[PDB]
Amino acid sequence: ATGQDRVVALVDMDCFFVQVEQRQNPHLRNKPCAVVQYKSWKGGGIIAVSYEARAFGVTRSMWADDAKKLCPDLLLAQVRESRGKANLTKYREASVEVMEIMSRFAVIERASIDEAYVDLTSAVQERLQKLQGQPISADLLPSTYIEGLPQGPQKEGMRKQGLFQWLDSLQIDNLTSPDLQLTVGAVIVEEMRAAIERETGFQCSAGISHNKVLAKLACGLNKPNRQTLVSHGSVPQLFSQMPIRKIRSLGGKLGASVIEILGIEYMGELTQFTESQLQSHFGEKNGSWLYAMCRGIEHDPVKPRQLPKTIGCSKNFPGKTALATREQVQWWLLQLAQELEERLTKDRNDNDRVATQLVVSIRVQGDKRLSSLRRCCALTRYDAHKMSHDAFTVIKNCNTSGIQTEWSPPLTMLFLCATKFSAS
DNA sequence: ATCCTCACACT
DNA sequence: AGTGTGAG
Numbered sequence A: 001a002t003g004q005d006r007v008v009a010l011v012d013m014d015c016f017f018v019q020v021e022q023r024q025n026p027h028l029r030n031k032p033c034a035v036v037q038y039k040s041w042k043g044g045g046i047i048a049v050s051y052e053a054r055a056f057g058v059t060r061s062m063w064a065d066d067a068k069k070l071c072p073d074l075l076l077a078q079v080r081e082s083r084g085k086a087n088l089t090k091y092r093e094a095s096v097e098v099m100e101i102m103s104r105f106a107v108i109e110r111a112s113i114d115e116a117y118v119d120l121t122s123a124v125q126e127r128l129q130k131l132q133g134q135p136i137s138a139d140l141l142p143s144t145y146i147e148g149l150p151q152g153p154q155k156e157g158m159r160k161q162g163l164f165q166w167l168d169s170l171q172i173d174n175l176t177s178p179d180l181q182l183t184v185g186a187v188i189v190e191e192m193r194a195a196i197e198r199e200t201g202f203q204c205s206a207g208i209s210h211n212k213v214l215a216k217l218a219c220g221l222n223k224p225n226r227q228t229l230v231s232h233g234s235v236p237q238l239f240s241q242m243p244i245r246k247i248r249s250l251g252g253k254l255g256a257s258v259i260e261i262l263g264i265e266y267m268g269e270l271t272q273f274t275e276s277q278l279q280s281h282f283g284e285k286n287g288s289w290l291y292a293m294c295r296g297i298e299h300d301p302v303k304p305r306q307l308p309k310t311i312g313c314s315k316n317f318p319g320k321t322a323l324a325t326r327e328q329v330q331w332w333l334l335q336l337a338q339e340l341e342e343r344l345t346k347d348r349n350d351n352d353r354v355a356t357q358l359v360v361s362i363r364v365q366g367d368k369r370l371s372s373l374r375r376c377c378a379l380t381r382y383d384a385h386k387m388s389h390d391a392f393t394v395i396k397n398c399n400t401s402g403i404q405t406e407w408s409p410p411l412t413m414l415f416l417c418a419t420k421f422s423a424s
Numbered sequence B: 001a002t003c004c005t006c007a008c009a010c011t
Numbered sequence C: 001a002g003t004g005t006g007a008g
C-alpha cells in the first residue's frame, strides 16, 4: 500500500486580498503594497502583502506603521468597515469567482477563502484514454516544477531541465502508472490555472501529488504563480530535511511533542519507529497517521464541499477598549447580530438552507484562551434584534458584577455563530 | 493590540 | 453540549 491511488491538487491564490485590490485599482499593480484593517491603532493591521513588499520584510500581522519602517514606499489598500468591523465581502465574492471556475474541471473542496483541494483522479483517467498513448509535451506544462529534479551528471532554465528529465523517463504506455497520472493531473491544473487567470485576472500557485498533505506542501515549494508536482518517489529526499512543523497539522503542540519526545527534527526521521511505538507516544489515531504520513501516505478524502458549514461573526476589543457597560455589550452584540442576519439571509437564498442553532461566546479580560465560554440557544428567525437579545440572555449571567448597568469582568471578545443547517 | 473565519477531536 | 487544537 504505497498511497498512490489518487491524484490530488491544492490550489492557493497568491497574496489573495492584494490581488483583489490590485485588479480593482490599477495604480497598485506591480508595486509593494499591502491590505490593512483598522487604521487607527498603529496604522492598521496588515492582512495581506504583495511579493514586492515581502522583499522588504513586510509580513502579515505587522502594524502598517511598522511595515512603513521596512518599506517606506509601501502602498496600502484598506478593507471595508461596516458596523465597526472589517467586512470581507469583496474578497468572499472574488473567491466565489475562482471556485466556480475550478468546479468546471473537478469537484472541489473549499479549504479557506483562497484555497481549494481538487480530486483529479477521474479527470486524469478520462484524459489518459483521450491521449491514445502519445507523449506529454513540455509545452503542456509551462509553469510546472518537478520536485527533486534536475539531478545527476537561471531559475527558468532549471525548471525546464527538471521537467525534461521527468518527461524523458515517463512510461506513457502504462495507463495505471502513478507518475503518469500525476503528470496528466499537472496538465489539467495548468489548464485550470490558465482559466482562472483569463477569467478573473488572478494568479495562483498549486501543488499536485497523491494526497492533500503532499499537495499542500508541494504548492508552497515554488510560489508565486507556479505549480509543483511531488511524486511518491520524491518523498524520501524531500522529507529527509523537512522540518516536522511544515506538514499540515504538525505546526502546533502535537508537532512540538513529536520533536521533543522522539528527539528528531525532520519528517523522514519518523520512518525508523514502528507504528505501535508512535501510537504509544501520540495515541492510536495520531500514531497511525504519523506512521503512514512520513512514508508519504495519507487518506483524508477531498470532500465534495464547496461552501462552509458554520457562519460566525466575532469582534475583539483589546486593551482599554474592552467592553465594561451593559449597553456597550448590547450594542456590539447587536452589530454582530446584524451582519450575521445579513450573511444568513444571503445563505438562505443562494444556498437553500436554514441555520437552526445560535452559539454565543465571550472572552473576559484576564483569561488566557481564545474563548472563555460557549453557550448555545435556538436560532429560528433571521432577525438581528432577537438574536442579539437571545445572545445577551445566554451570557447575562456571566456578569459577576452586582450592578445591573455595569459589566465585570470586562469583555475582550464577543462571538455569534449560526450552526446546524437544514435544507431549504 | 493580530484579528477574524472555519473545521474537527475529545469528553 | 462545552473545550481545546490547528489552519488560512
Ligand SMILES: O=c1[nH]cnc2c1ncn2[C@@H]1O[C@H](COP(=O)(O)OP(=O)(O)OP(=O)(O)O)[C@@H](O)[C@H]1O
Pocket (backbone or CB within 6 Å): A012, A013, A014, A015, A016, A017, A047, A048, A049, A112, A113, A114, A223, A224, B003, B004, C008
Ligand atoms: O493568521 C491569520 N489570521 C487571520 N486570517 C488569516 C490568517 N492567516 C491567513 N489568514 C486568512 O487567509 C487568507 C489567505 O491567507 P494565505 O496564508 O494564503 O496568504 P496570502 O494569500 O495573502 O499569501 P500567499 O498565499 O501568497 O502566502 C488571508 O488573506 C486571510 O484572509
Ligand SMILES: [Ca+2]
Pocket (backbone or CB within 6 Å): A012, A013, A014, A015, A016, A114
Ligand atoms: Ca494564498
